From Swiss-Prot:
Major site of localization recorded for this protein: periplasm
Binding site for substrate: 184, 193
Entry note: cofactor: Binds 2 Zn(2+) ions per subunit.
Protein name: Metallo-beta-lactamase type 2
Highest taxon, organism lineage: Bacteria
Taxonomic lineage: Bacteria, Pseudomonadati, Pseudomonadota, Gammaproteobacteria, Enterobacterales
Cofactor(s) for this UniProt protein: Zn(2+)
GO biological process: antibiotic catabolic process; response to antibiotic
Oligomeric and partner information: Monomer.
């Protein structure tokens, strides 16, 4: 198959597997990155990344693809490659790159979770809410009763940044943590779309993510390949410029 060469988002490199319209990359024996692409007319493709985690006899998903059809392709890939049921998905804020495929998850009977605030914003953002709401303590950690049977997914709300509702997820038992759209890579020159951002609190929120997962060495994010912790520090330094 031909390589997909997005205008925004990482390129395909060694270890990147094309499946239909999407790309998959194994990050750890039990963790894979899913990548889907939105074609913007006149601009080209924008890649967005999420995660797939095997936890024993079940699979957990972080973020949908941009669309329902792409998200059904993620479920197809899981069926072919892993052949275990998806127990739940957690989506990391109410924008299209992270929640555009909710209906595909629901059609498949998968339990969906998002920040309560994401669910409240979804109908205002042209999204369908997740079926369950996560809530958070004053220090950002998820209230465990709201995240039942999450296995290795450790959900952390770092504060407002890219959006007010953005959440992040550490993968316990690995050195991986997922920043979603809050974190950009260590070579990025921009924080991306700031239209819904909290420019005052962004730098502290980025740093809070790093402090929540202080031994995560592989930082996964929505629009770049997995990076070092310099993604966190560089994002925070860019965000310092917003104040
Ligand atoms: C990659 C993006 C610049 S766009 C994406 C998101 N936007 C969407 O999901 C929009 N529905 C969209 C509109 C036009 C073109 C592409 C995406 C956002 O506003 O954070 N996340 C941004 C980001 O992570 O900075
Ligand atoms: Zn967003
Ligand atoms: Zn994004």
């Amino acid at each position: 198959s031909n390589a997909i060469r997005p205008t925004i988002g990482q390129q395909m490199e060694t270890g990147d597997q094309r499946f239909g319209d999407l790309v998959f990359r194994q990050l750890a024996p039990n963790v894979w990155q899913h990548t889907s692409y939105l074609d913007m007319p006149g601009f080209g493709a924008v890649a967005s990344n999420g995660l797939i985690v095997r936890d024993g006899g079940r699979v957990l998903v972080v973020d949908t693809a941009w669309t329902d059809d792409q998200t059904a392709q993620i479920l197809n890939w899981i069926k072919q490659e892993i052949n275990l049921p998806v127990a739940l998905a957690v989506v990391t804020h109410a924008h299209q790159d992270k929640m555009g495929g909710m209906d595909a998850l629901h059609a498949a009977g998968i339990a969906t979770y998002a920040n309560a605030l994401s669910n409240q914003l979804a109908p205002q953002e042209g999204m369908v809410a997740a079926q369950h709401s996560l809530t958070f303590a004053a220090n950002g950690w998820v209230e465990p009763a709201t995240a039942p049977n999450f296995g290795p997914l450790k959900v952390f709300y770092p504060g407002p940044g890219h959006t007010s509702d953005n959440i992040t997820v550490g993968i316990d038992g690995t050195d991986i943590a997922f920043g979603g759209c809050l974190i950009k890579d260590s070579k990025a020159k921009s924080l991306g779309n700031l239209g819904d951002a909290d420019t005052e609190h962004y730098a502290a929120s980025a740093r809070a993510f790093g402090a929540a997962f202080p031994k995560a060495s592989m930082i996964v994010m929505s629009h770049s390949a997995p990076d070092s912790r310099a993604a966190i520090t560089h994002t925070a330094r860019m965000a310092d410029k917003l104040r």
